[PDB]
């Protein structure tokens, strides 16, 4: 009975077109409920109103009043009288203020959702003598009902103004504190498009919340993962806020040292390209290329190269020239600035087949059953991608190729490294230079020839140093030299022949291309 | 296609290659026209087509450079005629999966209506003349009731197909929006001409009882369509959904007020409605739940077994799954209604 009249009145405001019915609705609302005058009302509603206690009727009718007020204030441009408040609008506002001051959680949530974006439209000077009390409702809104606000935050489709107001209010509230659901709501907010202002608000709230208890591990279910993803999104969105985000990231790593790297590795594959790469551009700042930056690079780069090589055909072939150029700049920046990480990733096929292993490898480098085939395949795909993206001949170093004659990796992996380099030199000889290369290119070719000669010289002076009942076991060893079955090969002529294949490709490059 | 078994990515290749290396439009899409004709013949219940082959043909037409949509455009009316009828699934069963087929057909239909709505709404008027034409004099004729229920079912399937296409391919700059947003107001009227006439002429058959489920499924599908349109864009979609609900809420309230015993069944649909939005987490759901709750709370005194429990429980990505579940429910209900009406 009551709902019939309520919906009949509300339909005027709920229309998608503008008409001349809302004035009558406002007058009826102010004359019937607030002022207690049932004139012009039918007997059914007249009996129903007196049937229930008045405050229950007010609670039931409040959502309609809130909806009408929100719709009328949100369409100030549509009605066209933006200079002041409409008479029907003023009456509706006064009725709403009377009902508020003079299942409740659902109504509170509805009010918060409706008036979070529509709070700035109401000004402190817009309230006349009649709306004097409304200050006590609107003045706190220019800054627990915050539970309802937080519940309204978890909405995939909310206007930017209301979300910004909610974030501002929660930042203000947590400023004076100095729930995890607050973090969840902010993260869900950041899953959509983010403006610079709300990005700064999010950075401030996350740097403030670190003072509050958030995964204390000085020893998205975990709050640390949510905070890390939020910080990554903030950095990718991005003056001094860069420094603030970096300090927050350092603190977050200090909290969960082990979890930090795992979260980075997961994020490498979670988001697609043009996002991890843009995040790395924001972090490293390698556009103008020459503590935790190295940690993040070490955690990310291996998986990033793996994912880039997995989709190499769909990366440089299409019109992703900007993305591919950014990836190449990132790889060159890591090679010239981080070193050890890049060398580990390039020589992954040797490291993933045998932490302390890398240190032993570099100590030997400075000195100068079956094998894990999958690790070697992955490392060789990574190495192929790296030599495709890096400058021709820079990868790998001549010292690396010299030491690969006598290293601790399986012989098959080292020969695969040699053969990958050999086929790269061969393709460079054919004119099949890397696609990005195909005046600057002339310098690249010249430097490639010089670096190939560097490889040749190093491998040559290493091979020169290397060169300078028993029958039963000899036959036994000779008859089962299965290279995929290690410990029957390394513990050397085949490796020297793979190196000689690299030198042969170098020589056939120098005798034809460089001479011309 | 008809008697044997083939594979896609070859039929599409053959049709596209025939579209190339030819001059006259007569021989440009000869293979495409043949494929469309074969699919139509299968939908006309004349030839034994394997269900996998039917799905392959529908996917081939959906993928269309093979000029398949051009040949479909001539018989989109026939496609709508096939989709509207309720016995088509049962008759095709003579030769579970069928609902999928319907959705696929809906997609292409929506796609065609997507192309035909550019400042003129030619496809909307031509293919669906009754969309802007509510029942004459707003009468409750049983034949008018059946026709309007069928039209609402057709609209629900069209919206389901459009939503499925949008979910599968949201990267398109132009969303598949066959029904205009303003036109929804008109469709609101149609829904009420099912709900207003329900108490008098619902006991003549079981299909009239399933028309309750059909109407509420269409209502929730339209709500989700408006929500998706607003998310992709803004004010127009939410305002149209608001007007639709403000038009159909007095209808459902008076439907409850008619008979105080059958409300239970109706209540089911109503709570099911919010359940759908509970699965969809729509903005309009949060907007309208503070007023939808008293509708059942005031009727909690008339709930038989566990509807009060459901109201208490609901008192306090997945879109594709919800769309598929709704499609399966619609197909199953249509098949059951055809089985019951065959008596």
Q: Which of B141, B246, B231, B125 is nearest to B185 (CA)?
A: B246
A460: number of Cβ within 10 Å: 15
- Taking the CA atoms of residue B273, residue B276, residue B280 and residue B285 in that order, the dihedral angle to the nearest 10 degrees is 20
Q: How far apart are CA A354 and CA A350, in angstroms?
A: 8
- Angstroms from A280 CA to nearest CA on chain B: 26
DSSP A64-131: HHHHHHHHHHHTHHHH---SS--HHHHHHHHHHHHHHH--HHHHHHHHHHHHSTTSTTS-TTT--STT
Count of other CB atoms within 10 angstroms of residue A138? 18
Phi, psi of A370, deg, nearest 5: -65, 155
Q: Any idea what DSSP says for residue B134?
A: P
Q: Which two tokens stand for residue A270?
A: 């979670």
Instruction: Assess contact for B98 and B83: CB atoms under 8 A.
Output: no
**Do residue A155 and residue B283 have CB atoms under 8 angstroms apart?**
yes
Residue B342 Cα, gap to closest chain A Cα (Å): 40
Chain-chain contact of B283 with A157 (C-beta, under 8 angstroms): yes
Check if the beta carbon of residue A297 is closer than 8 Å to that of residue A331.
no
Closest CA relative to residue A375, chosen from A306, A313, A311: A306
The shortest C-alpha distance from B242 to chain A (Å) reads 6
Kind and range of the H or E run holding B191:
helix B184-195
Q: Which of residues 131-160 of A touch B (CB under 8 A)?
A: 152, 155-158
* Cβ-defined contact of A110 to B243 (cutoff 8 Å): no
User: Residue A340 contacts by C-beta under 8 Å, 6 or more apart in sequence?
Assistant: A358, A362
The minimal CB distance from B290 to the residues A4, A16, A110 is found for A110
- Interchain pair B286, A64: CB under 8 A: no
Answer whether A11 sits within 8 Å of B182, measured CB to CB: no
Using the Cβ of B314 and the Cβ atoms of chain A, whether some distance falls under 8 Å is answered with no
First-to-last alpha carbon distance for chain A, in angstroms, is: 96
List all residues of chain A from 424 to 463 with a beta carbon under 8 Å from chain B: none
- The closest of A228, A135, A214 to A181, measured between CA atoms, is A214
Cβ contact A103–B293 (<8 Å): yes
Q: Which residue on chain A is closest to B239 by alpha carbon?
A: A16
**Torsion over CA: B167, B168, B173, B177 (sign):** negative
Residue B139 contacts A where some CB pair is shorter than 8 Å:
no
- The shortest C-alpha distance from B250 to chain A (Å) reads 6
Residue in chain A closest to B293 (alpha carbons) equals A103
Closest CA to A460 of A398, A510, A388: A398
A487-509: burial string, b at 16+ Cβ within 10 Å, e else: eebbeeeebbebbbbbbebbbeb
Q: What are A370's strand-pairing partners?
A: A485
- A-chain residues within 8 Å CB-CB of B181? 16
Q: Closest CB to B243: pick one of A14, A64, A157.
A: A14
A428 and A513 in contact (C-beta within 8 Å)?
Answer: yes
Subunit contact B287:A113, Cβ cutoff 8 A:
yes
Kindly state whether B182 is in contact with chain A, defined as any CB-CB distance less than 8 angstroms: yes
- Is B278 in the A-facing interface, judged by CB distances under 8 Å? no
Contact between residue B66 and residue B29 where contact means Cβ atoms under 8 Å apart? yes
**Contact residues on chain A for B287, CB-CB shorter than 8 A:** 67, 110, 113
B chain contacts of residue A8, beta-carbon cutoff 8 Å: 250
Max Cα separation, chain A? Answer: 122
Say what the resolution is, in angstroms.
3.2
Whether the bond between B262 and the residue before it is cis, its omega within 30 degrees of 0, is: no
Determine the Cα–Cα distance for residues B315 and A272; give it in Å rounded to an integer: 39
- The torsion region of residue A339 among left (phi > 0), alpha (psi -120 to 50) and beta comes to left
Listed in sequence order, the residues at least 6 apart from B337 whose beta carbon sits closer than 8 Å to its beta carbon are: B86, B206, B207, B210
Torsion, Cα A384 A388 A390 A394, to 10 degrees, reads 70
Pair of tokens at residue B243: 């007007």
The alpha carbon of residue B318 is apart from the nearest alpha carbon of chain A, in Å, by 13
Q: Which of residues 196-255 of A touch B (CB under 8 A)?
A: none
Q: Nearest CB to A63: which of B246, B291, B297?
A: B291
Look up residue A292 and give its two tokens.
């935790």
Q: Which two tokens stand for residue B93?
A: 């069963």
- Residue A395 contacts residue A332 (beta carbons within 8 Å): no
Closest alpha carbon to B218 in B196, B188, B183, B250: B188
Tell me the residues of chain A between 2 and 61 that have a Cβ less than 8 Å away from chain B.
Answer: 3-4, 6-8, 10-11, 14-16, 60
A308, A327 Cβ separation under 8 angstroms: yes
CB contact B242 to A (< 8 Å) = yes
Report d(CA A71, CA A307) in Å as an integer.
49
**Interchain pair A106, B289: CB under 8 A:** yes
Contact A4 B253 (CB under 8 A): yes
Q: Is B288 left (phi over 0), alpha (psi -120 to 50) or beta?
A: alpha
Distance CA A248, CA B259 (A): 63
Interface test with A, best of B253, B274, B286 (most A CBs within 10 A): B286
Cα three-residue angle B295-B296-B302, rounded to 5 degrees: 120
- Bridge partners, residue A485, by sequence: A370
In Å, how far from its chain's centre is CA A148?
28
Nearest Cα of chain A lies from the Cα of B330 at a distance, in angstroms, of 27
Q: Which of B182, B244, B290 to mutate to test the interface with A (most CBs of A within 10 A)?
A: B290
Contact A157 B297 (CB under 8 A): no
Q: Check residue B7 and give left, alpha or beta (phi > 0: left; psi -120 to 50: alpha).
A: beta
Contact A106 B239 (CB under 8 A): no
Q: Give the three-class secondary structure for A272.
A: coil
The span from the CA of A256 to the CA of A234, in Å, is 19
Question: Does B250 sit within 8 Å of A4, measured CB to CB?
Answer: yes
Contact across the interface for A63 and B290, Cβ inside 8 Å: yes
Q: Which of B238, B241, B263 is nearest to B252 (CA)?
A: B263
């Amino acid at each position: 009975p009551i709902q019939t009249f309520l919906w009949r009145q509300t339909s005027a405001f709920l229309r998608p077109k503008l008409g001349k019915q809302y004035e009558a609705s406002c007058v009826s609302f102010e004359r019937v409920l607030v002022e207690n005058k049932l004139h012009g009302l039918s007997p059914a509603l007249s009996e129903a109103i007196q049937s229930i206690s008045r405050w229950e009727l007010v609670q039931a009718a409040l959502p309609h009043v809130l909806h009408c007020t929100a719709t009328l204030l949100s369409n100030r441009n549509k009605l066209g009288h933006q200079d002041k408040l409409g008479v029907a609008e003023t009456k509706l506002l006064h009725t709403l203020h009377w009902m508020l001051l003079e299942n409740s959680m659902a109504t509170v949530e509805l009010f918060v959702f409706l008036f979070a974006p529509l709070v700035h439209r109401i000004k402190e000077s817009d309230l006349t003598f009649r709306l004097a009390s409304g200050l006590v409702i609107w003045q706190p809104m220019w800054e627990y009902f915050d539970v309802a606000v937080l519940r309204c935050l978890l909405q995939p489709h909310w206007s930017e103004e209301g979300t910004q107001w909610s974030l501002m209010y929660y930042l203000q509230r947590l400023r004076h504190m100095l729930l995890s659901v607050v973090l969840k709501a902010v993260y869900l907010v950041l899953n959509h498009d983010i403006s610079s202002r709300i990005c700064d608000v999010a950075l401030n709230i996350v740097e403030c919340l670190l003072q509050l208890g958030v995964v204390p591990c000085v020893e998205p279910v975990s709050n640390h993962r949510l905070a890390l993803t939020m910080l990554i999104k903030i950095v990718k969105s991005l003056q001094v806020f860069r420094e603030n985000a970096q300090n927050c990231l350092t603190k977050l790593y200090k909290l969960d040292k082990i979890q930090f790297r795992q979260t980075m590795r997961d994020y490498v594959n979670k988001d697609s390209l043009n996002n991890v790469v843009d995040f790395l551009h924001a972090l490293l700042g390698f556009c103008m290329e020459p503590n935790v930056e190295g940690i993040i690079v070490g955690a990310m780069f291996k998986s990033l190269i793996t994912r880039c090589a997995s989709t190499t055909h769909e990366l440089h072939s299409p019109e992703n020239l900007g993305l591919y150029c950014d990836i190449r700049q990132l790889v060159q920046f890591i090679k010239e600035a981080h070193g050890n990480v890049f060398r580990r990733v390039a020589l992954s096929a040797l490291l993933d087949s045998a932490n302390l292993g890398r240190k032993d490898f570099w100590r030997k480098m400075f000195k100068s059953n079956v094998v894990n085939l999958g690790a070697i395949r992955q490392g060789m795909k990574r190495f192929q991608f790296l030599l495709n993206c890096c400058e021709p001949g820079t990868i790998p170093d001549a010292s690396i190729l010299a030491a690969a004659l006598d290293l601790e990796a399986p012989v098959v992996a080292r020969a695969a490294l040699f053969l990958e380099c050999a086929r790269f030199v061969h393709r460079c000889n054919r004119g099949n230079w890397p696609e990005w290369m195909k005046k600057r290119n002339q310098k690249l070719q010249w430097s490639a020839a010089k670096l190939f000669y560097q490889w040749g010289d190093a491998i040559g002076i290493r091979l020169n140093e290397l060169c300078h009942e028993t029958k039963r076991r000899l036959r036994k060893e000779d008859e089962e030299e299965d290279f995929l079955d290690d410990s029957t090969v390394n513990p050397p002529f085949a490796l020297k022949m793979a190196a000689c294949q690299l030198l042969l490709e170098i020589t056939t490059f120098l005798r034809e291309t460089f001479s011309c | 296609i008809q008697n044997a078994v083939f594979t896609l990515a070859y039929l599409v290749e053959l049709c596209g290659l025939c579209y190339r290396a030819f001059t006259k439009e007569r021989d440009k899409f000869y293979l495409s026209r043949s494929v469309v004709l074969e699919l139509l013949q299968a939908l006309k219940l004349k030839s034994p087509l394997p269900d996998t082959n039917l799905l392959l043909l529908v996917q081939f037409i959906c993928a269309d450079g093979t000029a398949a949509m051009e040949c479909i455009r001539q018989y989109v009316s026939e496609v709508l005629e096939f989709m509207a009828d309720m016995h088509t699934l049962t008759k095709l069963k003579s030769h579970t999966f069928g609902g999928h087929l319907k959705v696929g057909l809906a997609q292409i239909a929506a796609m065609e209506i997507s192309r035909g709505n550019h400042r003129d709404n030619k496809a909307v008027i031509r293919y669906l003349p009754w969309l802007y034409h509510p029942p004459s004099a707003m009468q409750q004729g049983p034949k008018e009731f059946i026709e309007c229920v069928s039209h609402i079912r057709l609209l629900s399937w069209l919206l389901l197909g459009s939503l499925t296409h949008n979910a599968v391919c949201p990267n398109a700059s132009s969303p598949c929006l066959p029904i205009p947003l303003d036109a929804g107001s008109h469709i609101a009227d149609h829904l009420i001409v099912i709900l207003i006439g329900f108490p008098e002429q619902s006991k003549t058959c079981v299909l009239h009882m399933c028309s309750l489920f059909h109407a509420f499924i269409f209502a929730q599908l339209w709500t989700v369509y408006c929500e998706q349109s607003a998310v992709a864009t803004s004010f127009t979609a939410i305002l149209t959904a608001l007007e639709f609900w403000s038009r159909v809420t007095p209808s459902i309230l008076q439907l409850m007020a008619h008979n105080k015993v059958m409300v239970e069944m109706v209540c089911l649909h109503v709570i099911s409605l919010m359940e759908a939005l509970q699965e969809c987490n729509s903005t309009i759901f949060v907007k309208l739940i503070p007023m939808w709750l008293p509708m059942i709370q005031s009727n909690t005194k008339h709930l038989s077994a566990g509807l009060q429990l459901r109201l208490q429980a609901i008192q306090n990505a997945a879109l594709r799954k919800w769309l598929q579940c709704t499609q399966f429910k619609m197909a199953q209900v249509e098949i059951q209604s055809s089985e019951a009406a065959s008596q």
